[model samples]
Target: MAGALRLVLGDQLSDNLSALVDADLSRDQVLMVESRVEATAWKHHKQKLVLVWSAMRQFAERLRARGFNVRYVTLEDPDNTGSIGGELRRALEARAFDRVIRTACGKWGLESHLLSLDLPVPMETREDDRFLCSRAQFAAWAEGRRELRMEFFYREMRRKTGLLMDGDQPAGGRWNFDAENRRKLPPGLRPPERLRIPPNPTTQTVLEQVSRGFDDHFGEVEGFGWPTNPDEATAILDHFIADMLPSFGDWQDAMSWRRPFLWHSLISPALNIGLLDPLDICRRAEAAWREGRAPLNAVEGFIRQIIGWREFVRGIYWLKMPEYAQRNALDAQGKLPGFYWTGQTDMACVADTVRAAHDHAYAHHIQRLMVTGNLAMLLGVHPDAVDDWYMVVFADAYEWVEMPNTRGMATFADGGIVGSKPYAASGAYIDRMSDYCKGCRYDVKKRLGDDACPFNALYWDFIDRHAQRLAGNGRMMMPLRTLEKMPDAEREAFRKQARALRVKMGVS
Candidate 1:
């Protein structure tokens, strides 16, 4: 009897994966492939490429070890076609399979291509089991709502899941523990030791392949060893709960040049790729609260990220995609500053965060939002540029997740769908939460000078530039009022300097 062929994308890798768990190994040929088209499409961070390929290869090996016959296609295979669609077409022609199975979640392009395939076998795409919420469920919940707020959705999730709920109300009469989780780390406070999974020879081989094959890719690949399998991902989650969760809430929004991963879970890639399921992780955090190992704020904060923000953005993506990628609410027209790609700048916050991203395909959420994302908004870079950079850089950056964060929250390109107000901020906000300002050449307080931080001037300029579109908005009134209060002469000076700086930064 011939076998069914199962197609597994890089992001879908788990023993319990919906498409694979019920497969008849004796009559099913499991398929996994790495394609050069995906690698070269976006000029991705080298570390991002290595992480996905290594994890996929490891997942394949684990399946083979469990007595499953797998048809693994390596990137270097001579007969390898260059894309998912191509490989599937070739496989269908070469082997006589009765059916094909896949789990949802791949590039939209690939999904469309698969839909167009004229294979003899019937293709079935299973619902992604990794996420806590389903597309249909989120769609039903989203119906008839004027505003789709994450907090309201999060409360609904808590009710449905019985997480952090006391009867029908949130635990301790609070739906969100965010207010209690905003403490900056006091001086000399140290992050708990992060879990480090040693690389196997297979990972080293993959790393070497990435370095050799993609030598010209955008970001650095040195010291690149993220967990490649479920065992390591579980260990990382356990370590985070035990050692980091206690302090995670206190420093969740804090940033420092010296410590990039301060009490952060750092499990986004693992969760995204199906090495660890989101609901299981949420349950583990809830269990920690029950055992008194982690506080309510810490557990609740983590749950909000996974269940609330993560799921909410995915829903918005499905509701608005194919067109969501084209939105440019601000009409921003400047080029992205060259410094974003090189991290070669006198701006300490920008340099520090970009360098961290370059070095380790990672930076906590605060660094992404406050430093890089804020700087791009201040400089008025096109939302397309900002969105592409985010999509290429982060390991956890699938378009569904990255688009809203970059286009809507960071750049306001979606015109307030994701954020009611723009997240514009001056250097003072960065200086308040981080230590990057301490040794910088520019003065954080100065709005115009040879040594004035560009952010201070550009902050006002961004507001001034968007005044017509945003002036009537109630949420924007306070910031507009603050900018209006500046002395006329000072405001003009700031605007002049900001224009010159934008030109110098190669943005215009």
Candidate 2:
């Protein structure tokens, strides 16, 4: 009989999970649960639910093939319990175990729940070592630091991993290639077709279940392309390296009116859910540069996202959680516009991003960071509303990753923890980067009246609304100085136009 029970969360699906370390397969039983509470934690996208549920089932099959005792609890099981705690309690009643072992999960509530559980046997929580930077090491690095700058943290990551380093110095004599990575897509430049994995029988089954159960969810699962297992995820990564990586840097920040997945390595959904290894992904990108298969700029940019920003955000998330989720620095209190959910908006950029999100349950970082995210901040929508929308809509969204990106990067709601400056931008920035403004109903240059782009007025309004609060941020002075030079009547007109735009968008 198995003497120990091992708990595996949906995201902890990797074979190298620390929870399985030193496991005696003969004496261990694995507990996998599809709890209703987790599924309905937020109004999760239909595709996200399908992706998670299908991936979990596939991982369980792999475990069974390896001769592990798998106790899989389906969501539709007659005796199903709606929460992880309920499932654990039921499992305890059915089987006797000397101890329980599990990896520390990402969500604070779930982690806290496991810690507070009055388990019949001792429970051991192991570090999730999939990340290059450990939480403790990150805390040590962060301790007493006046500012948690990602560039400095990223440099240390480069030094530690020896990635893109030349004899202890950064490759190309620069730690960042971001300036070279921001070119807009030129005319007639079309991205390669996305390599979408057709749903397997397991994924199809999961999709039907999600469609029926979560019909009211934010996104559709009809053409869901996410990989449901490690092999498929690896295939996507391989495809990206072979085809899209060369152009990824030059157009990484470019957005088209309707083209959403432009030159992006769409590996985040699989990576987040443990179908792919982060370090492995980073090394492969570095290998591409070494082999001359891709440009140094593209490879370095991609690698930085994985080991640099991804790990840094994860560290910030853990170090400042619970409280971090609630830090609304700008005091934005407006409701998220209804167009966010419906894609019924006049702003071509906003509409296109929402359309892509609805169809694929995914968006590239620029679309997330600059388009929808910037618009939300300019509209003064509360971070909670923005956070909930992000959490519910994207396939890659989980509290650990999404919350920091949302509250910190997207909305600047965490004051200045994750980002130094609020990413507030006017239509001119959008016009420079994307084709969205070409056919937009409003003029990008206009700052007042009905024909003016809402973003133009809203950008000035956001700066004016938070002038004192943002006065200390050095990056903000240019915009403040620009605002200061504007005529009083013109500024007040912008404020009036901004208010009208807000009301028109159904913001409170």
Candidate 3:
């Protein structure tokens, strides 16, 4: 009486995964495969590969411990196949299952492969309940919307879940507490001691495998302390609630070259995977507010990111994926310079951020958007190149999350889908946020000459290059008007030097 064969993806590791909740274990066999296809794709970071593989193996072991038969396959196994589709085909031919049940693949590439399987047995693709918002639910909410804004969707989520809500209205009579959350750290501000979970045997195995298999990858494998299991994920979450959540909102956008993780919750890798449920995390943060362990602004801001923006972007991805990945509204044409990969740039901000990513596979949101992504956009690097770098380098990077953030929000490559204007800015923005400007050779204020910060010249250059297209954009109008008001000869001189700088940087 063997029931359906369940196919579990690496990201869908929750014991409460939709396909497993009501599963008939006595008559069902779970299938989890580790394939070289996924491992070698995009040349993923050493730590990234280790995290997924180890988590998947641990999850399978947990299932087997519960007496559920799992047809597990590893990449190193003698009989192992090299791809998920191939493994599924072999498994189905070997045994007669009533049906194939799986939580639908989040990535379109995998989902398309799943749909192409014209097997005799029916495949029941279940909704991914790991997320707080359903694809269908978000779609219904998005119907007839002029612009698919996160704020609107987040408000709906707040109403549906009653998070940060007082009956029909939001708590404190406002939806966003952002105003109370923008304090810069004074010189002597100190953070509580961070909780670091020591690696277990499973994690050690992953670290070793990463060192051996992905030796040439960009990031370092040492200091790999990310939560690899649900228990550790919960501990990380508790740590964030107690120590970080108090000031997370205030400094979420702050950046300092000296301190990488300042007051920020570094639990995105766990949350993005199935280790920590977003809604439960939000509820716990809200509880911290009720218990007075953290302020309402801190808790609410964190909750909005998960319940508000995360779910919103996910819905947009599904609604406009496949083609959404191809939407390069900005016809950016420069190559991603070698400096990005090597972290050898003269610019301290770029060098620091890239080096930090190399060392720890983590960067705060501002670093990603303002420093890395902004530079790529301003320099006119091809969106694909920028997208690939972000995807392969980060542990939390998956297509679902990375694409929208990189292309739409950060690069504005999809035009106005994620951001109203290009985040193009001079070196001033970097200096204002970080200590990177302190010992830098380039002048943060200079817009010309050898010592001039490239960002300063490029910021004006980007505006001038796109002036015709951006002239009417409401968000760009004020900046454009200011640029227009500069002395005509001065403007020409700046434009001439900017073009020379682009040529000097080898940006076509």
Candidate 4:
């Protein structure tokens, strides 16, 4: 019998994975499988497919080079069984492995299978150590809290990481630089070019495999240029630290027609794929500020995203999952519009964001949060539709992260689970932050009429429809109060416009 077998999943590619902690290379074997069950689960974007497959293949090659015997299963392997369980059972039958070990899978569904797998020997599931906060630790912090908020969690995270800390206190006399981070792009200023890693022969081959196999996938794959290895991913982090770190915070929320990646670090896919370590990237960003290479606002903002928001969302995911997936507090039941895939909508902001996602399997946080996500919530689309779209479109959208962001932060389907308030906003907010409205078919300034931005009518309609439910939320009291005092004609106009939009857009 084989001494032991450690399974490394697509997203868990780092050599320092917990599954490898007790590995005995002399007798232990490593397994990496490219299961079709995962690749085609949700009609995933083509670029996302390329990213995961190429990263997994390259990581297996590294494992081979590291003197470990690897049973690597490619997507096109003739005997591929298309599911993780089937492949694991086949592997066990083929070889005489005594035990199975793995880093716990991120998706709750996937992990449950590991937890209850029928095998001759038991499987030992290790906690994913890549995250700064462990699941148990987060559960401890969350116990007995009336309401959980990111700001408070972030402050505690800052103390734990000691990032931007002044010994016993926070640096810069403030815990957050969010107040200084939302300036719109000025007319003359331009963001620098983003770092791109063109596909190599191996990645190109993987792209061809994805293209030929998943002919009916959602996104176009012609523009696949993501890093498929750790070295290139590190280069991206270094380049961002050297060049864009100073300007990232200042224009982080700004969006422009000409610039899709304005000063944003596009390292999310790499981080998600295990090509870059989150803690290492956080330290590099922190180091830049201490050496006076970048400003505190820039470094702190970027650092907070990794150490604070990223970790916080992950903790929240594990703390409240399975049941968390089905929470739709507002009870929205609208259908997802056809234009989400086509980018054919007259709403310029949404069209640009969708097209960007189609091209790159990416759109910065603000575009995702304020444009498409905002539109989804304002239109009262069902949380399931929102969750599926986010999962299908983005390269970084593993369920652990995507559910919290889409269900909680985006649609507020989980009520206050992800945030203290829903992130509902009108087109005026979009107009101030982006150049999308400058050429849109509708007027950003209008609140009522045929030409009014859809967000305006939908925003007010959302508040008016749910005012009674939202009345208890202190964060939304001002908007709820305004809805209470709105004139009958204008309020009726919003309802009228919203009704027409619901029909035209196939919403509930």
Total backbone collisions, model 4: 0
| Candidate that beats the other on TM-score, 1 or 2, i.e. the better one | 2
TM-score of 1: 0.96
lDDT of 1 at 426: 90
Model 4 pairs whose backbones collide: none
The better candidate by lDDT, 1 or 4, is 4
Candidate 1, residues 340-403, lDDT tens digits: the string is 8898999988888888888877888988987899888888789889988997778788887888
Over 4 Å off, model 2: none
C-alpha TM-score for every candidate = 0.96, 0.98, 0.97, 0.98
- Model 3, position 28, has a per-residue lDDT of 86
Model 4 per-residue lDDT tens digits across residues 347-428: 8899999988888899999888889998898888999999899999988889988888889888888987887788899987
Cα lDDT of all candidates, in order?
0.83, 0.90, 0.83, 0.86
lDDT by residue for model 3 (1-508), tens: 5588898988888888888877787888899998888777778878788788888889999999997889989777888888888888888988888888889767888887888888778888899978888999988987887677788788889998899887788988899888733434565766556676677898898789779877988889888878889999889888888888888777787776657788777888877779888878998999999888988888889999899878877888888888998988779888888877898888888888888788778888889999999988888888999989998888898888888889988898988776666787888888776667767989888888888888887888788878888976667887799888888787887788777866776777
Query: Where in model 1 is the C-alpha error above 4 Å?
Result: 180-183
Q: Candidate 3 — which residues are off by over 4 angstroms?
A: 180-184, 190-193
Where is model 3 poorest over a 10-residue stretch in terms of lDDT? Answer: 180-189
The alpha-carbon deviation from the true structure for residue 161 of candidate 4, after best TM-score superposition, in angstroms, is 1.8
